[PDB]
Amino acid sequence: IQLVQSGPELKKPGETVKISCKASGYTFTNFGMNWVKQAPGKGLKWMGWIKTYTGEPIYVDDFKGRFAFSLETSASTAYLQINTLKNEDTATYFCARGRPEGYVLDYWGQGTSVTVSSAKTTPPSVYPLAPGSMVTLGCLVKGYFPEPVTVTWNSGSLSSGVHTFPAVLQSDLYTLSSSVTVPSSTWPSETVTCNVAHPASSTKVDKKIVP
Amino acid sequence: IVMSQSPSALPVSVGEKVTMSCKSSQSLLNSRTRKNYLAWYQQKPGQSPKLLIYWASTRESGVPDRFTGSGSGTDFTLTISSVQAEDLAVYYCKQSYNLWTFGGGTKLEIKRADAAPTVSIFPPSSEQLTSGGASVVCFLNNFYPKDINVKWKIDGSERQNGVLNSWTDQDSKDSTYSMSSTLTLTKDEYERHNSYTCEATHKTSTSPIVKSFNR
Numbered sequence A: 001i002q003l004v005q006s007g008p009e010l011k012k013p014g015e016t017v018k019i020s021c022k023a024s025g026y027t028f029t030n031f032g033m034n035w036v037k038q039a040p041g042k043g044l045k046w047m048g049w050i051k052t053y054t055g056e057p058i059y060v061d062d063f064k065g066r067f068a069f070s071l072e073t074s075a076s077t078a079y080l081q082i083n084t085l086k087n088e089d090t091a092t093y094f095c096a097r098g099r100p101e102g103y104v105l106d107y108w109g110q111g112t113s114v115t116v117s118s119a120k121t122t123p124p125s126v127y128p129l130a131p132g133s134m135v136t137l138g139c140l141v142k143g144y145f146p147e148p149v150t151v152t153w154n155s156g157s158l159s160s161g162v163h164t165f166p167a168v169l170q171s172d173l174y175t176l177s178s179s180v181t182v183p184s185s186t187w188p189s190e191t192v193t194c195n196v197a198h199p200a201s202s203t204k205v206d207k208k209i210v211p
Numbered sequence B: 001i002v003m004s005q006s007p008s009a010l011p012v013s014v015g016e017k018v019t020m021s022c023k024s025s026q027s028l029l030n031s032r033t034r035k036n037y038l039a040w041y042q043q044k045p046g047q048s049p050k051l052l053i054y055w056a057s058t059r060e061s062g063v064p065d066r067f068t069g070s071g072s073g074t075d076f077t078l079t080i081s082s083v084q085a086e087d088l089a090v091y092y093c094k095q096s097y098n099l100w101t102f103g104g105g106t107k108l109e110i111k112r113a114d115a116a117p118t119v120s121i122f123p124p125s126s127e128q129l130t131s132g133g134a135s136v137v138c139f140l141n142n143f144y145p146k147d148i149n150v151k152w153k154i155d156g157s158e159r160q161n162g163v164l165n166s167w168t169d170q171d172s173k174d175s176t177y178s179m180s181s182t183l184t185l186t187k188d189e190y191e192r193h194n195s196y197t198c199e200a201t202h203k204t205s206t207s208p209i210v211k212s213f214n215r
């Protein structure tokens, strides 16, 4: 049994999005199809289900009006349509089959990411973070859209003492920071550079950290 | 029908016994079928949730034996007899008595010795200032436990607006947490003041861990 959902979606507020979920390996019309919302760092929220035999959908109160579950039974596909998007709609959406023994969500799709922003694709500005036994450096990757950016240090050669903070979306654009810690006896003696990529804008930036 | 899980986070050691609870605002037991309609799900990062327990205490096929669910009525428990590395996840309870509603989840974390944050503060770069902006950045790195607070002061006065904050998840290598805080202002605003201060509060120190730069 497999449930395959469509790819990630980028939308501006007001538009509609339709997500698909293709099911295989079982008789589609014998089990309910469920939709679950998960905002980036939050928990799971069951949205409702649709009876695949009869096509009737059932929505929890928070999802009445703007959301539409639909089916194409011959193709074993369930659809989630979200109309008039808001920023609060930014989430991963899972489809999941309902198994009546237990009344449980036993097989899940991989999830579909939807991001709602009025931003168009925007390349980041990359800035070095230089201070003032161990020394901590950083890079600031500021004002880009959409996710992801990738950051490595010394073209990948620097592995430990590195971590990258989750991007946050504020005022429709993302900002993130990377950190690297190295022995104070090795910098600025041995050079340290952050390599940033933003695939959506084909951006590749190498930024040496200088004192 | 509200599902409530505690604790919200649970520090564990590999190999030891772990218990987490779910309470419902209303009974989940069907007298007609002596059945408690309460299930447990595991979700690891980046993955879809996975069903572990249904009917309060029936293990899903394939789920290892160290997972057991128990309880009835309104009080339920998930037990991991011996916790493995592969079990660090978020665990969700979900009732299917009347509609299907999830609890808020309990996240398992690795416990370790307390560690104070290493605080670094960074002036804006010359290249940002030429653009007109100016971000001051504070890193609070490699602390434990996860709770921390950060305060910015400009010329001795607390500043709240313009502050952006980011939190890592627990690091897989040293089991610590980190925090970044960004204060964004214009070049003019930045050049008006002289003293920039990032102060951290964490249970490892009775006083704030302060770091600053001048000008």
Ligand SMILES: O=c1[nH]cnc2c1ncn2[C@@H]1O[C@H](CO)[C@@H](O)[C@H]1O
Pocket: A031, A032, A033, A034, A049, A097, A098, A099, A100, A103, B096, B097, B098, B099, B100
């Ligand atoms: O996939 C499904 N999602 C949600 N509810 C379902 C599904 N399949 C059956 N039921 C409904 O769940 C009730 C018990 O909680 C059953 O009465 C049934 O109508």
